[PDB]
Amino acid sequence: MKQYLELMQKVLDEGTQKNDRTGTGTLSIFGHQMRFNLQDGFPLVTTKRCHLRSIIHELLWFLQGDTNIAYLHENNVTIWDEWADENGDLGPVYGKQWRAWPTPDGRHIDQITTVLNQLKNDPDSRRIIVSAWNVGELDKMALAPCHAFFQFYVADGKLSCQLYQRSCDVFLGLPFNIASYALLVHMMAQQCDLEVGDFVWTGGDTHLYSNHMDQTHLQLSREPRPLPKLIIKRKPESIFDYRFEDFEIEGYDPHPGIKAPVAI
Amino acid sequence: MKQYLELMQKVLDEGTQKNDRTGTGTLSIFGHQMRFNLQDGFPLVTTKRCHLRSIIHELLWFLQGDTNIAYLHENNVTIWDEWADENGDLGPVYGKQWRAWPTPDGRHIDQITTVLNQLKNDPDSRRIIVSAWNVGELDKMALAPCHAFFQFYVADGKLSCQLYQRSCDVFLGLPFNIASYALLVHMMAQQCDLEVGDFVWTGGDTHLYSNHMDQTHLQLSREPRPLPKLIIKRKPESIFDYRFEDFEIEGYDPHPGIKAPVAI
């Protein structure tokens, strides 16, 4: 899609050479913002075919407060294997912070139920936020949260959401992360009887890996295709009741998928 | 300044009518990003005279982990009186989270010393972040943090910083908040032997109060003047050693200050 393709070209055009953790060099820009009107269609990159099944499974896993790989495995979703230990444990990552933020005095905060309450009881609030950046549990996580902070906003019966992404692999990570949060806004909106608004993406260190140049140039050649339409075939009793089958993406005609390897 | 004036006009041009906590209506836009190259001069609004002394005093107060009004009072700085209790206590706000984030197991995390370590030992890190959004202490704070999350970034010997502001009063709050963080980048940079880079401002609910329309129109009439130059007359032994006298702003020729009242 247009905004995505503009970002890629920008990193090429003005990114500085910056190496990552003992490895691959990257082209980096810092601070960037994109806006997707979810009313214009589901923001799934069309200039390269992307598979939604791992995204859906991972989101539903975040919502259950699950921090172990078991559920993803039952569904043959393997995107977190890289980080899990021999027990399939990832540490207090996303799921754990969203559903059970540990307090100094022994409580566990359900940030997403809190948010749902605010969206229904105080829609004009400027504090409808969920954070996965728990400073006290950072050392125990398999990896610090990439998408660390997100805020919801209601205006004219429309639910918007802004995500702060501290680090971003534009080619491999971003397409996957935009869809994941877009999908979450739709679920949130359906649950609160609100129309979908905007999904604003805000990133910090936004980069392209040096060994992805051929692929980015290949993708930059393609012309974006019309955005698909996301359809929820059911209306669960709560946000923790969604099933993989509930979602259907209609009208998705993408260019062929592109593969990008990684150093180790 | 230009970016600031563009924001004001934008809120006027496309902001929706949105009321705040049991009160004044506002014009609101959600998600906005501005960039200031600190090498081009200190970002202090010139189209309306602003006073830096309360800013400096407040920043130095944040750095000391102080959460009580006493220090500001000794200096006749009264911007936090509104929130303090009869004891001058504000609760675990900014200062407390920056210098002593409480963990579930009894530790207190010095986020700013952590950051300083990372800037000197691992400058290419994508995790150089300080968060004041401690979910477990939110109920105890006089008010939830407005400027809740900020990330540092190093590239080409230049220190950049991105701030996420959940809520923003464009006329009254923003000018004060841009200068405060710009000043902090300079101190951080000086301490780490780095040049200043960019200060990226990212906001969520960015608004203008309805009863500020005359003032915004007055300010929107003025032509921005050259940005002043920030000079630190000393190089303290640590970031916790700065004194009010250390800072001097040179070449500041602003238009007359404008006052904006508030409902109660």
From Swiss-Prot, chains A, B:
Please list the residues that make up the active site. Answer: 146 (nucleophile)
One GO molecular-function entry? thymidylate synthase activity
Mind listing the UniProt keywords for this protein, alphabetically?
Cytoplasm, Formylation, Methyltransferase, Nucleotide biosynthesis, Transferase
* Pfam name, any one: Thymidylat_synt
Q: What is its EC number?
A: 2.1.1.45
- Keyword Protease, does the record have it? no
Which pathway is this protein assigned to? Pyrimidine metabolism; dTTP biosynthesis
The Gene Ontology CC terms held by the record are: cytosol
Q: Which CDD domains match?
A: TS_Pyrimidine_HMase
Quote the catalytic activity from the record.
dUMP + (6R)-5,10-methylene-5,6,7,8-tetrahydrofolate = 7,8-dihydrofolate + dTMP
Q: What does the UniProt entry say about where the protein is found? A: Cytoplasm
Q: How does it assemble?
A: Homodimer.
Q: Which HAMAP family match?
A: Thymidy_synth_bact (MF_00008)
| Described function | Catalyzes the reductive methylation of 2'-deoxyuridine-5'-monophosphate (dUMP) to 2'-deoxythymidine-5'-monophosphate (dTMP) while utilizing 5,10-methylenetetrahydrofolate (mTHF) as the methyl donor and reductant in the reaction, yielding dihydrofolate (DHF) as a by-product. This enzymatic reaction provides an intracellular de novo source of dTMP, an essential precursor for DNA biosynthesis.
Name-wise, this protein is Thymidylate synthase
